[PDB]
Design a protein around this ligand. Structure first.
Ligand SMILES: COc1ccc(NC(=O)[C@@H](C)Nc2nc(=O)c3cnn(C4CCCC4)c3[nH]2)cc1
Ligand SMILES: COc1ccc(NC(=O)[C@@H](C)Nc2nc(=O)c3cnn(C4CCCC4)c3[nH]2)cc1
Ligand SMILES: [Mg+2]
Ligand SMILES: [Mg+2]
Ligand SMILES: [Zn+2]
Ligand SMILES: [Zn+2]
Lengths: 322, 320
């Protein structure tokens, strides 16, 4: 099982990579390859043995949730990796920025519990109390990421000078905190503002672009081939129901899109695709045209397919009406 | 002792109150009085007994630092109390806002370790790593505040509907997080921006004002009579120097303004009074003119005194 075939290693570079075919060790090997392949091990003097141990801690710090598990972690990092090639991001970003994008992608959901921020806050959990209701999950993911890096045996940054560490740390924090969907509209507005006259030499412009990139990868499941993308919806709804169930037997509010009685696989995706994914990737296409064909296309197909599924679903519902 | 006298109860409403005369149990009694006096106990159905246990928990959660200790906590709240009367804040703010201001003031520095954010961040402390370098101390103060309020025996908000709690919690977090001096100019800029045409109806305007109010009380030591204020400068430097020593000892960056070899009592206060205190109180005076005579005058006087103490210091150094 261990040892990636050259076929796999080449497939790893595209958004068509079948993320379900592999097990922890294989995905870990793939992640390891990405760091070597992108020139990060080289340019940052990353002890290659430390790189593997680090990946092991990361994996150990992910929970067995239906959706927010290590495989999701792998999907986001693999999609980021695909973006780097598709958009030749190495022509626009320094290696440090590439390191930040990949590492934040891998760490962005560390120790996720399976219940979102709205639950944390409403249920006044320890995390919501610790972070004063401000992106409790994302703040936690960052903290865990750096508690891991604080451990010598897992410190892939041990050979980077202090100034570079601070720059990397700051960049990662910004990107991980940017994955909080509550800030989606805000961040999209900020990006579309800079978008009027984007400037690659403008640090603030690049910061927003990196935020949009990790955001894109985080919710990119529907960009993948239908057979690869569809099973994720079930995983998502499983986790969502696990929460709405709890919020119900606790008297806490319940979100409709998480309601076991109102949400279907299709209605869970149609809106998300039309008003979240497509708009975001469209803006990104204004910067990278190749994105439209490789990523906006599968999104359009997915949207149409789900709208058809919804009609069959509505038909069955009509037959259940009394 | 813990039974405040009529004289004490009346003096407690002015910024001239001598905070050094009382012991913790007496200060606790004073704080307790403030909640009854302001109508917070009535209007929020605070169980009087719970109010006492809570204050005891707050007190227990402050550390014995030379500056950031329970007495600092008391000064800020006592100054906020003074302000409510001086500016007639109950005419401008709801009882919920008064509650937010008073409770935030009391909890704003909970469990402060005696070393600022720069130290937490540079030493990569547990707190800095937990808060991702974002106002680690203030975030912590706020977390402890609600960890205490989470305990049923200390929950002074136990009889407040959920919607009220949320509005209060959000308010306190905003105010406690606003006490990070790294954000001083930023907050002053936003406030002054609103001040171009202040609107008591505008919630965003009122949020900034509350932020400025708590900020004023937090660094209001020099507004107090010279005899009350003077001792604080020594507590301030003691704490500051404890940090710079440690930083030197651990090979960490040292901030000149906290450096034991460069800071004198006069240089510590002059700039602070002239560029932080006065400008901030000047803007507030625009909304509350009575503040000029009660808080600015003491400031101008302290400024002039410390400026003189400086010329004397320089002449003494020069003489050698
Ligand atoms: C605007 O903030 C939002 C936060 C969560 C959602 N969730 C959805 O709309 C649900 C019903 N559908 C959905 N489809 C996806 O493929 C997908 C991928 N990620 N996510 C979620 C984004 C938050 C974490 C999981 C998805 N949600 C939608 C919007
Ligand atoms: C602009 O933000 C700043 C933050 C801290 C300082 N500190 C100082 O200037 C020191 C030397 N003097 C000073 N005098 C005071 O009466 C006073 C009261 N509080 N503080 C500090 C405010 C931050 C916490 C302690 C004071 N600092 C100066 C400026
Ligand atoms: Mg997340
Ligand atoms: Mg403080
Ligand atoms: Zn994620
Ligand atoms: Zn303070």
């Amino acid at each position: 099982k261990y040892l990636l075939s050259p076929e796999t290693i080449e497939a790893l570079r595209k958004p068509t990579f079948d993320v379900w075919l592999w097990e922890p060790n294989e995905m870990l090997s793939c992640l390891e390859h990405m760091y070597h392949d992108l020139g990060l091990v080289r340019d940052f003097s990353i002890n290659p043995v430390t790189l593997r141990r680090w990946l092991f801690c990361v994996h150990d710090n992910y929970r067995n949730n239906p959706f927010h598990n290590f495989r999701h972690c792998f999907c986001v990092a693999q999609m980021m990796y695909s973006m780097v090639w598709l958009c030749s991001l190495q022509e626009k970003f320094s290696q440090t920025d590439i390191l930040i994008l990949m590492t934040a992608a891998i760490c962005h959901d560390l120790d996720h519990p399976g219940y979102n921020n709205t639950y944390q806050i409403n249920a006044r959990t320890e995390l919501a109390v610790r972070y004063n209701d401000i992106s409790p999950l994302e703040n936690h993911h960052c903290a865990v990421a750096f508690q891991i890096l604080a451990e010598p045996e897992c410190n892939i940054f041990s050979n980077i000078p202090p100034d570079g560490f601070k720059q990397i740390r700051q960049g990662m924090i910004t990107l991980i905190l940017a994955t909080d969907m509550a800030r989606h509209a805000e961040i999209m507005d900020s990006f579309k503002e800079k978008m009027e006259n984007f400037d690659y030499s403008n640090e603030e412009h690049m910061t927003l672009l990196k935020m949009i990139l990790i955001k894109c990868c985080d919710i990119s499941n529907e960009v993948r081939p239908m057979e690869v993308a569809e099973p994720w919806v079930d995983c998502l709804l499983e986790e969502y129901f696990m929460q709405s169930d709890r919020e119900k037997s606790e008297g806490l509010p319940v979100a409709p899109f998480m309601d076991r009685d109102k949400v279907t696989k299709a209605t869970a995706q149609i809106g998300f695709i039309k008003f979240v994914l497509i708009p975001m990737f469209e803006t990104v296409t204004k910067l990278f045209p190749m994105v439209e064909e490789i990523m906006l296309q599968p999104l359009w197909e997915s949207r149409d397919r789900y709208e058809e599924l919804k009609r069959i679903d509505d038909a069955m519902k009509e037959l259940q009406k009394k």
